A paper describes a structure:
Heat shock protein 90 (Hsp90) is the most abundant ATP-dependent molecular chaperone that plays a key role in the folding, stabilization, and function of a wide variety of client proteins within the cell. Hsp90 is a functional homodimer composed of two identical subunits, each one consisting of three domains: the N-terminal (NTD), for ATP- and drug-binding and a co-chaperone interacting motif, the middle (MD), for client and co-chaperone binding, and the C-terminal (CTD) domain, for constitutive dimerization as well as co-chaperone and client interaction. Indeed, this domain is structured as a two-layer sandwich, formed by a β-sheet on one side and a cluster of α-helices on the other, delimiting the ATP-binding pocket, a flat-bottomed cone of about 15 Å in depth. In fact, molecules targeting the active site behave as Hsp90 inhibitors by competing with ATP and preventing its hydrolysis.
The only exception is represented by one residue, namely Lys112 in hHsp90-NTD, which is replaced by a different amino acid in the protozoan counterpart (e.g., Arg97 in Leishmania braziliensis Hsp90-NTD). Therefore, we decided to replace Lys112 with both an arginine (K112R), representing the parasite protein, and an alanine (K112A). To obtain additional insight in this field, we characterized the complex of JMC31 with the K112R variant, the “leishmanized” protein, and the K112A variant, specifically selected to remove the contribution of Lys112 to the ligand binding. The ligand occupies the active pocket in both chains of all structures, and it shows a conserved binding mode stabilized by a tight network of interactions. In all complexes, the residue in position 112, being lysine in hHsp90-NTD, arginine in K112R, and alanine in K112A, points outside the catalytic cavity, thus is not involved in ligand binding within the active site. In agreement with our findings, the contribution of Lys112 to the ligand binding is therefore not crucial and both the human lysine and the parasite arginine are not involved in the interaction with JMC31. The binding mode of the ligand is not altered upon the removal of the contribution provided by these residues, as verified by the replacement with alanine in the K112A variant. The peculiar network of interactions is conserved in each hHsp90-NTD variant and observed both in the substrate and in other ligands and/or inhibitors.
Residue numbers in the entry: 15 to 226
The structure:
């Protein structure tokens, strides 16, 4: 064992349905949101590194990398943001998902734009437009490396990660649905980034696969 299982609060099934009923026609939006979250965590590490530059001992470069993988049908997004404790992980993907689902629904119900999804703390869930399963590996300076995983049903799991150590930051791996392998194409990824994340204040690098 050492795997812990968590039940989503009921708002999550509502979230998933809202997301389909708001972004199904524009699925590419998930990349904007993930990049955006990466940007946020980058902002936090930059910020605390000003008061204490030892915060950057775990890695100085502040960036975002995008790693398609046609062979695995995965798209992974890596950042060296501040990363998450176990409690941040559970808090952001669980507690705040559910309270932010409610706030977002109330905001749309009063005519706010859907493009607001990010600001209600549930942008990440848009990932399930394109992915049957998502894994979030994260590592923050005051804590171990954790893996979070969910197919967005009723539960999510947390375990201590024993995989390749990142030094600090967050990795989201998307296991793409059969019908969404367009998100593994170099051309497509470049477009989406160009369109949605042009003004992100941190280098976003696409890692190309070779022919072999
Ligand atoms: C305790 C401090 N740690 C972090 O905050 C952190 N560290 N890594 N990430 C992070 C999280 C995700 C998602 C899986 C939630 C991500 O895709 C990339 C990340 O760097 C985060 C992270 C956590 C939450 C968010 C969401 N912020 C939304 C918020 C809404 C209101 C306006 C300001 C921004 C974005 C990034």
């Amino acid at each position: 064992e050492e795997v812990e299982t968590f039940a989503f609060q009921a708002e999550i099934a509502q979230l998933m349905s809202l997301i389909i009923n708001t972004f199904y026609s524009n699925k590419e939006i998930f990349l904007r949101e993930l990049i955006s979250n990466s940007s946020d965590a980058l902002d936090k590490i930059r910020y605390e590194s000003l008061t204490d530059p030892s915060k950057l001992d775990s890695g100085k470069e502040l960036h975002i990398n995008l790693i398609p993988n046609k062979q695995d049908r995965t798209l992974t997004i890596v950042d060296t943001g501040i990363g998450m404790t176990k409690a941040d992980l559970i808090n952001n993907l669980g507690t705040i998902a559910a309270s932010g689902t409610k706030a977002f629904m109330e905001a749309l119900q009063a005519g706010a734009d859907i493009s607001m999804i990010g600001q209600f703390g549930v942008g990440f869930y848009s990932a399930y437009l394109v992915a049957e399963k998502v894994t979030v590996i994260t590592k923050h300076n005051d804590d171990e490396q954790y893996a979070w995983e969910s197919s967005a049903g009723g539960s999510f799991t947390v375990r201590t990660d024993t995989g390749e150590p990142m030094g600090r930051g967050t990795k989201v791996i998307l296991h793409l649905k059969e019908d969404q392998t367009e998100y593994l194409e170099e051309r497509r990824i470049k477009e989406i980034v160009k369109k949605h994340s042009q003004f992100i204040g941190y280098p976003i690098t696409l890692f190309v696969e070779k022919e072999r």
